[PDB]
C-alpha cells in the first residue's frame, strides 16, 4: 500500500551523461552509441544569447572546439551537426553503457523522470509532467542544461525531453531529442510568456482512483455526471476538457474499484465546487495531476 | 530555479539489488561485496508470521535453501547468519558493482531515497523521511520487502533503511542494515499501532526557506517569535518542538535570505494559526516536512 510520486530508476540514464564544454560554456550531454546530444546554445556566450544566429555561430566551431568528458576521461569528437535546437557530436567510441532507447515526442499531460545533472554528474531524479502550456515545472540551476527526461519500458529508455531554458517566471522549456521545442519557445534570451497552466483532468482522475485503491474514500460522493456537464465545470476551473479517449484510458482503474469514470468525474466536480475543507488525499491538500492512468496502474501493480 | 521532491540517482543501488527466495517466499536482497542482506522473514510462511521464532525456523534452513539471483544468474551461498532482523548470506563472489558504502542508523526527520524493487528488479525511486513515530510513508506492494533506503555523499552510498512491514494503517516499518527496527516495531503479523505522526518542524522551516529562494514570498509576515512562544504553537499543532540545534542547522538558509530563523518561525506560526487561505507554497497546499535543511542547501546549490 501507499502511493508516492515515483521516478524511474535512473541508472541506465546516469550511464549516458557527459560534460560538454564549448569555450567558457559547460552543460550536460547525452551519450548514446557514438553520438553525444546537447543543447546547441553550448556554442553561445550570454552575449550571444540576446539574438543568436546558430548556423553563423557554428561556422566558428570545429570538432576539436567541443570538449566531451565521460567520467574523468575525454572523448574524441570526429563529427558535429545541428538538428533543430540540438548538436549531435559524433565521438570515435560507442558509449559502452548505451541502454536500449527510443526518442519519443510526448504530448501534454504525459509524465517522465528527469535526471538533474551538473558537469555531466547526476545530482537527483524527480517525476515531471509536460504541462498543457508545454512547460515543465522542474528543478534546474545554471549548468543543468542538457539534463534529460525519460520513461523506461522494462529495459528500453524512451528519451522525451532535454532541458534548455528557464522562462522569466521560473518554469522550464526544452526539446525532444530531435531538438524540437515543446510549445512555441525558442532558445533566445527574449520575452517568452507561458500560456494558461491548466490542470491535467485525466491525471487527477487517475490519482483519485489511486487514492480509493489506497483507502482514501472520504471524497467519494452520491453523484454521477456526463462528459458535457463535467466539462462545463472543468472549463470554469481551468481543467483540461475530458474526452472519451481519456474515459477509455481510465477503464482499467474503473474496473478495479467498480467506480464508473463518470461517477469519479462527479466526485472531482464536487471537490472543485466545495474544496477539500482542510482535508487531504494521498497526503496532498490539492488535486495532483502528475500521475497518468498508466503511472497509477504501474505503481499499484509493481511493474519493474 | 524550481524546487522538486528529488531522490538520489539510484544507479549505484540498482547494481546491488538481488532476488532472494527461501521456499515459496521471494523478496529483495542487497548485495554489497560478498554479503547479501535481506529481511529474516524470507524464511517464513504467512502461517509462520503469526508468532515466528526465527532462530527455531532458521535451524531448518541451510546455505543451499537460500536462492540468490543477481540478474538472471544464480549466486552460490557459502554461509548465512542472522543479525537482529536481517539475514547476511555470504556468497562466493563479491558484487563487482559494490559502490563505496556505509550503514547508518538515521534519526526521525532525516530524509532518504527508496529504490522500490520486486524480484530484485527496480520499479521506482522516491524520497521519504523517517517520521517522528519511526514509520515511513512509502509505496510498497507484496514482494517489495528488502527494498532499501539510502543517501549518497558524492560516491559513497549510506544505507539507512530496509523495508520489512506494512502496519494495518498502511504505513511502513523497517530496519537499518544492522537489522534493528526503527521504532518499537517487530517482524510479526500482530497488533502494531503507530504513535502520533507529528510534523518535522525544522524541515518545514527549511522548505519555507526554499520557497523564499524560489520566489514564493506571500507567507512572509511582519512578526518574529521566541523558541518558547513558537513551541507552544508547535505543540498545539502536533509539530515537533524546535531546539537551538534546529536553529543552528538552519543558519546557512537564514544567511542567504537574510530572514532570521525566529522570523521564519513567526511566519510558520501565522500559517498554522491562519491556514493557507487556498494559496500554495512551492505548488503545495500543505506545509511540506520531507526536506531537511541539508536537502534544501544541496538542491539550491546543485551538489552532484
Ligand atoms: C550560453 S549561457 O551560458 O549564457 N546559458 C544559456 C541559458 C539560456 C538558454 C536559452 C535562452 C536563454 C538563456
Ligand atoms: C513471509 S510472508 O510471505 O507471509 N510476508 C511477510 C510480510 C510481513 C512481514 C512482517 C510482519 C507481517 C508480515
Ligand atoms: Cl546550463
Ligand atoms: Cl515482500
Swiss-Prot record, chains A, B:
Positions bearing the Glycyl lysine isopeptide (Lys-Gly) (interchain with G-Cter in ubiquitin) cross-link: 5, 90
Annotated Peptidase C30 domain ranges read: 1-304
Modes of activity regulation: Inhibited by pyridone-containing alpha-ketoamides compounds 13a and 13b. In turn, alpha-ketoamide 13b (tert-butyl (1-((S)-1-(((S)-4-(benzylamino)-3,4-dioxo-1-((S)-2-oxopyrrolidin-3-yl)butan-2-yl)amino)-3-cyclopropyl-1-oxopropan-2-yl)-2-oxo-1,2-dihydropyridin-3-yl)carbamate) inhibits SARS-CoV-2 replication in human lung cells. Inhibited ex vivo by michael acceptor inhibitor N3. Inhibited ex vivo by compound 11a and 11b.
Q: Per UniProt, what does mutating residue 90 to R do?
A: In strain: Beta/B.1.351
Catalysed reaction per UniProt?
TSAVLQ-|-SGFRK-NH2 and SGVTFQ-|-GKFKK the two peptides corresponding to the two self-cleavage sites of the SARS 3C-like proteinase are the two most reactive peptide substrates. The enzyme exhibits a strong preference for substrates containing Gln at P1 position and Leu at P2 position
Q: Where in the cell is it found?
A: Host cytoplasm; Host Golgi apparatus; Host nucleus
Residue positions of the active site: 41 (for 3cl-pro activity), 145 (nucleophile)
Per the record, ranges on the Cytoplasmic side are 1-304
Protein name per the record: 3C-like proteinase nsp5
User: Which species?
Assistant: Severe acute respiratory syndrome coronavirus 2
The primary gene name is rep
